Coordinates of C-alpha atoms in Angstrom, one line a residue:
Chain A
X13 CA 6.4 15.4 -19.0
X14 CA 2.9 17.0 -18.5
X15 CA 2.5 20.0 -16.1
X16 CA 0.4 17.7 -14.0
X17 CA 3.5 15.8 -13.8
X18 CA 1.0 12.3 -13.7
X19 CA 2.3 9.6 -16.0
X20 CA 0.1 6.7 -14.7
X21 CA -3.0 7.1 -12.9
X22 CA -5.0 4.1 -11.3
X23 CA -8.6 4.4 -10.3
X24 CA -10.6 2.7 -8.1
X25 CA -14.3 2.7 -9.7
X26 CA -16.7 2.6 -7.1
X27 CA -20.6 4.3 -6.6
X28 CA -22.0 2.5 -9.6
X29 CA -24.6 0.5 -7.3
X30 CA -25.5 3.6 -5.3
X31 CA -25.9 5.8 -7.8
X32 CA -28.3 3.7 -9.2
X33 CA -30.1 3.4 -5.8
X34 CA -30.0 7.5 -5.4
X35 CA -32.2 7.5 -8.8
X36 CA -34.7 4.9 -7.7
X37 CA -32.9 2.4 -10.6
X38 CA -31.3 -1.2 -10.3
X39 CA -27.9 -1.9 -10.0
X40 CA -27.4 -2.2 -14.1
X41 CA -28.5 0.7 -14.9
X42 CA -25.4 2.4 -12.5
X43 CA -22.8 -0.2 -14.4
X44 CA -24.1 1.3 -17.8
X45 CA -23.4 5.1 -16.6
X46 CA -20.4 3.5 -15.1
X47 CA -18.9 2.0 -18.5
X48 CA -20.2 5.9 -19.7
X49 CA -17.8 7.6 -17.1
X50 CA -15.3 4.9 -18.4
X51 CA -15.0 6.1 -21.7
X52 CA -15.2 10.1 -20.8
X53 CA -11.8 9.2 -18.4
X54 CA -9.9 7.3 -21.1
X55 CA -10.6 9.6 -23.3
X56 CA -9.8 12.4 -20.9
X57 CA -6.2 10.5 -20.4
X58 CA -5.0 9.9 -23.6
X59 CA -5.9 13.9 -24.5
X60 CA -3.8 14.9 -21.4
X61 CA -0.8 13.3 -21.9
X62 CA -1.1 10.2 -19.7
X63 CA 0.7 7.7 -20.2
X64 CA -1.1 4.9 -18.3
X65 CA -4.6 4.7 -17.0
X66 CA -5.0 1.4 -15.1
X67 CA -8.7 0.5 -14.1
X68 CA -10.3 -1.6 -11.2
X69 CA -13.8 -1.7 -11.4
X70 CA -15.2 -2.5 -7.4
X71 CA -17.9 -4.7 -7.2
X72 CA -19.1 -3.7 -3.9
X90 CA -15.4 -8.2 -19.0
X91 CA -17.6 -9.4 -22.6
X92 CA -18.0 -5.5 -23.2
X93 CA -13.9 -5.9 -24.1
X94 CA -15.0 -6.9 -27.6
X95 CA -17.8 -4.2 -27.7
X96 CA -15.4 -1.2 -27.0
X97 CA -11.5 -2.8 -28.6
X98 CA -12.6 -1.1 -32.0
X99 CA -13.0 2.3 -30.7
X100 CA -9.7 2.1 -28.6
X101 CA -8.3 1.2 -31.6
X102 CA -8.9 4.0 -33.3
X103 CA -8.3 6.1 -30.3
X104 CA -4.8 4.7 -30.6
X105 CA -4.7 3.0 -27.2
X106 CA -2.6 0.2 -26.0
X107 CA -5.0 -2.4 -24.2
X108 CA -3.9 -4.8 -21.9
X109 CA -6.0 -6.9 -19.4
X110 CA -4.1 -7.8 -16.0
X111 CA -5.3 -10.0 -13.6
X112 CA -5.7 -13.9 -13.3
X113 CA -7.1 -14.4 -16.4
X114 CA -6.1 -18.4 -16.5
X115 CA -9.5 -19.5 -14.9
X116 CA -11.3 -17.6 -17.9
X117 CA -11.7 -20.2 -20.8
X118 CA -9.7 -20.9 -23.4
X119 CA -11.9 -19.0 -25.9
X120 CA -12.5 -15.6 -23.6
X121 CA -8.9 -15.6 -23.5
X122 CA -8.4 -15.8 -27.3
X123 CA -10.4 -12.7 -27.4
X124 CA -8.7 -10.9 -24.9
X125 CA -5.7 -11.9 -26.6
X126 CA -6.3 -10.8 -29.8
X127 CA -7.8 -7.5 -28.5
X128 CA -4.1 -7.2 -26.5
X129 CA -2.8 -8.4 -30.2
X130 CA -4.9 -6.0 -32.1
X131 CA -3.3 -3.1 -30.2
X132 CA -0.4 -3.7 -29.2
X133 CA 1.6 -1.9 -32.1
X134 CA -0.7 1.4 -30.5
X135 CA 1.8 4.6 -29.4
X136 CA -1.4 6.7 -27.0
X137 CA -2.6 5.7 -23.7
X138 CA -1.7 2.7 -22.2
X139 CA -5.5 1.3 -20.7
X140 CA -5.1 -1.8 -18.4
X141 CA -7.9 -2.9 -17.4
X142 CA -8.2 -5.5 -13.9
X143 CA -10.1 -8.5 -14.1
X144 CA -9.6 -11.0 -11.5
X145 CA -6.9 -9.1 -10.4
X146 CA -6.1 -8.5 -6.8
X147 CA -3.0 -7.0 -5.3
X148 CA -2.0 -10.1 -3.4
X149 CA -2.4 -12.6 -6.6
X150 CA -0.2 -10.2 -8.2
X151 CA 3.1 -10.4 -5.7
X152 CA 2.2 -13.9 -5.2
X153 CA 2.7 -14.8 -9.4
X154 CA 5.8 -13.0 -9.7
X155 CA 7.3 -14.8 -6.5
X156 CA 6.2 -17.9 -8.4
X157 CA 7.8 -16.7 -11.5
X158 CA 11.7 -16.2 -9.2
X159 CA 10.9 -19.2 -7.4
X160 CA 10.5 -21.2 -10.8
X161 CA 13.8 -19.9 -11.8
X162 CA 15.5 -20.8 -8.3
X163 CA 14.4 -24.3 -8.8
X164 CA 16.1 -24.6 -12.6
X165 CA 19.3 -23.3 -10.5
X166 CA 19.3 -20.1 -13.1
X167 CA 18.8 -17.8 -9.6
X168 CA 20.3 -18.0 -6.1
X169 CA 17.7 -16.8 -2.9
X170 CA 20.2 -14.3 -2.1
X171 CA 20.5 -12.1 -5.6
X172 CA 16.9 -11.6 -5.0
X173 CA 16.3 -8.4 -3.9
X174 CA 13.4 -5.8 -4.3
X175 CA 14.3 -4.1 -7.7
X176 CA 13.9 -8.6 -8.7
X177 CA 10.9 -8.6 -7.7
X178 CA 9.1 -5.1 -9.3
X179 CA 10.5 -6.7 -12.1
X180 CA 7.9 -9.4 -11.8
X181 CA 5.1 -7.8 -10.3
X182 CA 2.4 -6.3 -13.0
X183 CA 2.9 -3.2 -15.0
X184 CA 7.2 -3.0 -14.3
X185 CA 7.5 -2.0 -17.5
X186 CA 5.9 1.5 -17.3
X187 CA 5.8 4.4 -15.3
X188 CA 5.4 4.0 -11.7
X189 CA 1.7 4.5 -10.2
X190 CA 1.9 8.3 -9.6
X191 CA -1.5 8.4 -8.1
X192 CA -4.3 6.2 -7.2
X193 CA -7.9 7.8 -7.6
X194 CA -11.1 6.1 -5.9
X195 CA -14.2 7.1 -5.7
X196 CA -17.3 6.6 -3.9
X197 CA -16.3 7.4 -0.5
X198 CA -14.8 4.5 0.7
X199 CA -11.3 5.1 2.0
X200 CA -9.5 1.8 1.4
X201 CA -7.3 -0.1 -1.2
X202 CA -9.4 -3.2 -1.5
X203 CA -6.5 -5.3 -2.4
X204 CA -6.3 -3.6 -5.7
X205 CA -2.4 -2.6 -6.5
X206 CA 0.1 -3.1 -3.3
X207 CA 3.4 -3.6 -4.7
X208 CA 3.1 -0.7 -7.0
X209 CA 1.7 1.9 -4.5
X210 CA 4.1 1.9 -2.3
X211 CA 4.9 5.9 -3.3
X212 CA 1.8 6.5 -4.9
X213 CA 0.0 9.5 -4.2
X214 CA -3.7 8.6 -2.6
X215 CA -6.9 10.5 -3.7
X216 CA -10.4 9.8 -1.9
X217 CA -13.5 11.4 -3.6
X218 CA -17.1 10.9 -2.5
X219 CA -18.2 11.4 -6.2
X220 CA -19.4 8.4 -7.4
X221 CA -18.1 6.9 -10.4
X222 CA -20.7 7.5 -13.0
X223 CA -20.6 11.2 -11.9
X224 CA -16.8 11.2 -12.1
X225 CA -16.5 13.8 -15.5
X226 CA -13.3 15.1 -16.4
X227 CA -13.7 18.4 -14.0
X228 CA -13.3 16.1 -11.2
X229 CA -10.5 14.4 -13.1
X230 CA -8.3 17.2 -13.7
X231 CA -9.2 18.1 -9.9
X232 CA -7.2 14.8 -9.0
X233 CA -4.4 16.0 -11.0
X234 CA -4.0 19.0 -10.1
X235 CA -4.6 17.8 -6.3
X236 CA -1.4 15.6 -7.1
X237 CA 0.8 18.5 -9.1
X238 CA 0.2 20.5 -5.9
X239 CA 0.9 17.9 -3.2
X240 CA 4.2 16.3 -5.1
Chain B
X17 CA -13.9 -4.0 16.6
X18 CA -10.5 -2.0 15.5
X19 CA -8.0 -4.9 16.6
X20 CA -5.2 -3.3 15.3
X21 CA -4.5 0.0 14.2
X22 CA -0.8 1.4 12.6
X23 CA 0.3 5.1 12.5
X24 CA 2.5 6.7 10.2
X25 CA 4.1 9.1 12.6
X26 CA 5.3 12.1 10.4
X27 CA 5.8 15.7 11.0
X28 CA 7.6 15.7 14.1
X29 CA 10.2 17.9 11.7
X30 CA 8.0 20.6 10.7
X31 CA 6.5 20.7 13.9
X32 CA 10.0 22.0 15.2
X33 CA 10.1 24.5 12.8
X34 CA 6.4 26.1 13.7
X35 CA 7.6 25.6 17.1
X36 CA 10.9 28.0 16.4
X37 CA 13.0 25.3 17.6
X38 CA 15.7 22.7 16.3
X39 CA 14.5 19.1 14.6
X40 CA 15.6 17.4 18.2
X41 CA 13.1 19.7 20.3
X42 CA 10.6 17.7 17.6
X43 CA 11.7 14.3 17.8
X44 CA 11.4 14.7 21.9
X45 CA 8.1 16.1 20.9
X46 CA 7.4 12.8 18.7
X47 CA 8.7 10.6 21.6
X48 CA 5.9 11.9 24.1
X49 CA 2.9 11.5 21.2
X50 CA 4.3 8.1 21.3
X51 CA 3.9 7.3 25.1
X52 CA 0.1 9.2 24.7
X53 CA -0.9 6.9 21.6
X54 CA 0.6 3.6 23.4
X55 CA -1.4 4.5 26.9
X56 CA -4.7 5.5 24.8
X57 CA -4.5 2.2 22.5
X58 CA -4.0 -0.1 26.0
X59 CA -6.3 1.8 27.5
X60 CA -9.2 1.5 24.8
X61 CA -8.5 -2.3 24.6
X62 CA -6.7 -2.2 21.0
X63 CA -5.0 -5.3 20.3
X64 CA -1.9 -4.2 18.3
X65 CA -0.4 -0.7 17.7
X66 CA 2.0 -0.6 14.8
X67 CA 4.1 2.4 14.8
X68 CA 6.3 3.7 12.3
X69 CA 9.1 5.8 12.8
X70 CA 8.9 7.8 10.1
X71 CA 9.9 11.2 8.5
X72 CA 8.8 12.7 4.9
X73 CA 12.3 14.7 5.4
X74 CA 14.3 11.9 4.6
X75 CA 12.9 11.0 1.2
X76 CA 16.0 12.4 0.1
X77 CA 18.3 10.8 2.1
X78 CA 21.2 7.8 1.9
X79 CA 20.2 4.0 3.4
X80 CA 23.1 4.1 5.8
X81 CA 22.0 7.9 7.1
X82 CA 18.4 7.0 7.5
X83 CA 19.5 3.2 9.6
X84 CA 21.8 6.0 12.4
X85 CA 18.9 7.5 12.6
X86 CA 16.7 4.8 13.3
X87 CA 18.7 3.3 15.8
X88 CA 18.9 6.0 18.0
X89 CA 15.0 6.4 17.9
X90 CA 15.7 2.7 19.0
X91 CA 18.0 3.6 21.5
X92 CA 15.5 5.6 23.0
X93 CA 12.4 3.7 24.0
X94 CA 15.4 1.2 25.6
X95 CA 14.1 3.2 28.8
X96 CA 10.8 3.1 28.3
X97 CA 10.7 -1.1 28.5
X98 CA 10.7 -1.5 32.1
X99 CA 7.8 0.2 32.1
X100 CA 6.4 -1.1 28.9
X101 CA 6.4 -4.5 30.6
X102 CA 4.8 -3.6 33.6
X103 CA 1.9 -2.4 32.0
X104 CA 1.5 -6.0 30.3
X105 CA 2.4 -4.9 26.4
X106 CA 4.3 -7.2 24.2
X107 CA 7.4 -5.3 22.3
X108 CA 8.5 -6.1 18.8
X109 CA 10.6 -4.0 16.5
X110 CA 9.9 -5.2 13.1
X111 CA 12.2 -3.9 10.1
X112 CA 15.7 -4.5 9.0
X113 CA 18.1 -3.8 12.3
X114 CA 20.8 -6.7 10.7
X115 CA 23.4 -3.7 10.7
X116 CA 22.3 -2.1 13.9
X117 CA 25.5 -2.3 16.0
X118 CA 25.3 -5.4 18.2
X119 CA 25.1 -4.6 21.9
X120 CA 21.8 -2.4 20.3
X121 CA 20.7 -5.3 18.3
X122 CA 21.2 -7.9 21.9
X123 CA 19.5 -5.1 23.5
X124 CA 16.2 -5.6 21.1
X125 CA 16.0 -9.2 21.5
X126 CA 16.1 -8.9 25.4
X127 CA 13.5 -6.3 25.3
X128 CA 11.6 -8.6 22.9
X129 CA 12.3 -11.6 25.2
X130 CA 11.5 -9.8 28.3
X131 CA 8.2 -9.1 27.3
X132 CA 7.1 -11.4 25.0
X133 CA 4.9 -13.5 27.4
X134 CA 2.4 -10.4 27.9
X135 CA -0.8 -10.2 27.2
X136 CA -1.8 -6.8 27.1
X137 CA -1.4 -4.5 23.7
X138 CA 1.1 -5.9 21.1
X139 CA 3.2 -2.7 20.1
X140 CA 5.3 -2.9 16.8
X141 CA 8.3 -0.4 16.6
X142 CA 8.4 -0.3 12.7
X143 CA 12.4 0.6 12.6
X144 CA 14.2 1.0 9.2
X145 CA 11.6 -1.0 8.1
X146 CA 9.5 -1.0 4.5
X147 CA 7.0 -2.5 3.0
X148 CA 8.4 -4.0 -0.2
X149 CA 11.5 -5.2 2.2
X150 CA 8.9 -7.0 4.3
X151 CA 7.6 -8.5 1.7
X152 CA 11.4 -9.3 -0.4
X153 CA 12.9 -11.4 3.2
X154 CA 10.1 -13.5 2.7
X155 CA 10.2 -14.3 -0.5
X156 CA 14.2 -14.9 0.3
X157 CA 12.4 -17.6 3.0
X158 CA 10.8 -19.5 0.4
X159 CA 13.1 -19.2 -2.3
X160 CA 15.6 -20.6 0.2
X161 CA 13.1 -23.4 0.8
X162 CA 12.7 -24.2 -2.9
X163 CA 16.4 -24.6 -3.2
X164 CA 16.9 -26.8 -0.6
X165 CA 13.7 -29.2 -2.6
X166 CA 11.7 -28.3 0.1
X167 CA 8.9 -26.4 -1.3
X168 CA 7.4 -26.7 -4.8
X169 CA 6.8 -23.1 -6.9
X170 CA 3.3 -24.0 -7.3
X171 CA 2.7 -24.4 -4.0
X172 CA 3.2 -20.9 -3.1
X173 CA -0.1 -18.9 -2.4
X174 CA -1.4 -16.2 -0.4
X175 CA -1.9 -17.8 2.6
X176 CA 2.1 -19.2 2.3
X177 CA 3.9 -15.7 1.9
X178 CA 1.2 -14.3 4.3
X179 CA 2.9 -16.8 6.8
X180 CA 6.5 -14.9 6.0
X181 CA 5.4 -11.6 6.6
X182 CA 5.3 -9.8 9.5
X183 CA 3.0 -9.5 12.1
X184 CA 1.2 -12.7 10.4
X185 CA 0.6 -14.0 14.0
X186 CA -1.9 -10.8 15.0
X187 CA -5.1 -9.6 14.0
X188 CA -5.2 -8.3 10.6
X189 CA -4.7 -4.2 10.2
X190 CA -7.7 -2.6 10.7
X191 CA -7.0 1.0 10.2
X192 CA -3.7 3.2 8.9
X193 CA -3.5 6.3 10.0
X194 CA -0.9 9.1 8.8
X195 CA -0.9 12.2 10.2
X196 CA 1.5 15.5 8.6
X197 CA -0.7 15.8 5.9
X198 CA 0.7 13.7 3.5
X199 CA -1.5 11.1 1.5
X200 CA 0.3 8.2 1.1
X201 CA 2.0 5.4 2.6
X202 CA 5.6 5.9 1.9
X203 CA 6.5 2.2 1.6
X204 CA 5.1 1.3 5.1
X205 CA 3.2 -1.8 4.9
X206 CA 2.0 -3.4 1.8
X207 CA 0.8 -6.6 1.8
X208 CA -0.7 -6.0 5.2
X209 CA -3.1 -2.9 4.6
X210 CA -5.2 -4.4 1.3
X211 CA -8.5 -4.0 3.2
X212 CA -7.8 -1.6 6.1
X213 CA -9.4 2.0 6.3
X214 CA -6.7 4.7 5.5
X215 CA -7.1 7.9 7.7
X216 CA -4.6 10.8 7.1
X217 CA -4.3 13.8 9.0
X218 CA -3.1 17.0 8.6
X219 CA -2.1 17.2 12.5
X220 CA 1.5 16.5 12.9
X221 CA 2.6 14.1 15.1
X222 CA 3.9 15.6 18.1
X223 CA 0.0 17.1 18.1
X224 CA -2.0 14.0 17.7
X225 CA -3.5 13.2 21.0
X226 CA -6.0 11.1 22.4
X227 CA -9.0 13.1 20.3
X228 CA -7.5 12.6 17.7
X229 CA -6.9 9.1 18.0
X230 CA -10.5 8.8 18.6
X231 CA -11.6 10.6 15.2
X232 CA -9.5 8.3 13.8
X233 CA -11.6 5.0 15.5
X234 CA -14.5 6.9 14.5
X235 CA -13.9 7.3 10.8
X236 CA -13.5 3.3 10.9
X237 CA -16.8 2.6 12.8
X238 CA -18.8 4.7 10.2
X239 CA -17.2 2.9 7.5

């Protein structure tokens, strides 16, 4: 375990519009420093000894196949989570085979949230025990809530420890629910193409402090 | 427009101990913050209040300790309904009080009864409640339904569990506030705070008073 103490760390992503604004810019050029930052943090994570970085990008992707090589030989684990069924059949070929390509990786574990939303996500897994009610494999009453995180996205690595957003908003956005229920919660006004790893290693030290 | 606002109420414990005094001197403490906050929502034309008895003390604490202690917080606003219903509010616990001792738990529905035709401010006494819970009794509802052939899996969406959930019937949160200093949400609600402003506090509760409670409305009507 790291002295920060942080094994999975979600972050919300926002400011990428208003930095762009600030400079005189369009939005695009804030979403290229934004995908910028998002390398510099995943790279900061898997050299600190994180175990999973999970990533929300607030609007307030086709890049996947421009950045799965480098993970790769970062040796991260990518996995996309979200509702991914309304993408077509041949987006999610490639998102599978970038999950397939690294899969076998032993760093950082990067999800990344595309059509995701907090809601969705409680919502599929109470499909997934309602499913098995109706086959007669589970009774209503055996389901309890240690069932059901055993459903939801992400049960099958360490707990959210803390939740990051940036911007200045203060809110969740229907990002992760389920999951945050003991997560610590950590509002920065930097926006996210400003977001360096200073300011990273400010949130977890924030969170060794506070826990 | 903040239609409903909920409170995370912690710190009346370390409040005690900066006062020098025992925890109950802070939970008496906690109970007149209470009466403040529930005059100053009705009184600012809030729409719900969603309060939740709540301590960081007793993260480390068994199920069955933590339910004795919730219903004697219960016990205790049992004098304040009379009054409550004069003043036109609407009382619902909301939590898991099936193992509350009975006369308590026929005292609660009376209280509930008693006032459920006002309408005034909608105050929620969260009681040995938590989010995920909330959310588990009513997927328990539909998993029942789907049992009995009732209800298809794939007809279960959003708007279907948001129908199961409490406090489905009122506005939609609006702003969480937690005062004590702590920055999360400790299992309070879940699937009822994805878009409402989060406001935290380092006040403790027995010191949040009606300025406060305004910085709070003020931190949502910038945002």
């Amino acid at each position: 375990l790291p002295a920060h103490g942080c094994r999975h760390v979600a972050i919300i992503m926002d400011g990428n519009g208003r930095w762009a604004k600030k400079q005189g810019k369009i939005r695009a050029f804030g979403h290229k420093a934004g995908a910028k930052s998002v390398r510099r943090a995943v790279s900061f994570a898997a050299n600190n000894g994180i175990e999973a970085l999970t990533l929300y990008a607030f609007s307030s992707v086709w890049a996947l196949d421009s950045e799965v090589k480098s993970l790769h030989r970062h040796n991260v684990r990518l996995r996309i989570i979200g509702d991914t069924s309304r993408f077509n059949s041949r987006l999610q070929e490639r998102i599978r085979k970038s999950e397939a390509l690294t899969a076998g990786n032993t760093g950082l574990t990067l999800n990344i949230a595309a059509n995701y939303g907090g809601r969705w996500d409680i919502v599929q897994g109470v499909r997934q025990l309602a499913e098995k009610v109706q086959q007669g494999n589970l009774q209503p009453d055996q389901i309890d809530e240690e069932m059901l995180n055993q459903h939801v996205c992400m049960h099958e690595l360490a707990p959210v420890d803390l939740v990051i957003r940036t911007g200045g908003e203060h809110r969740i956005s229907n990002f992760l629910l389920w999951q945050i229920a003991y997560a610590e919660l950590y509002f920065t006004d930097v926006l996210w193409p400003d977001f360096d790893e200073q300011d990273f290693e400010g949130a977890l030290n924030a969170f060794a402090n506070r826990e």
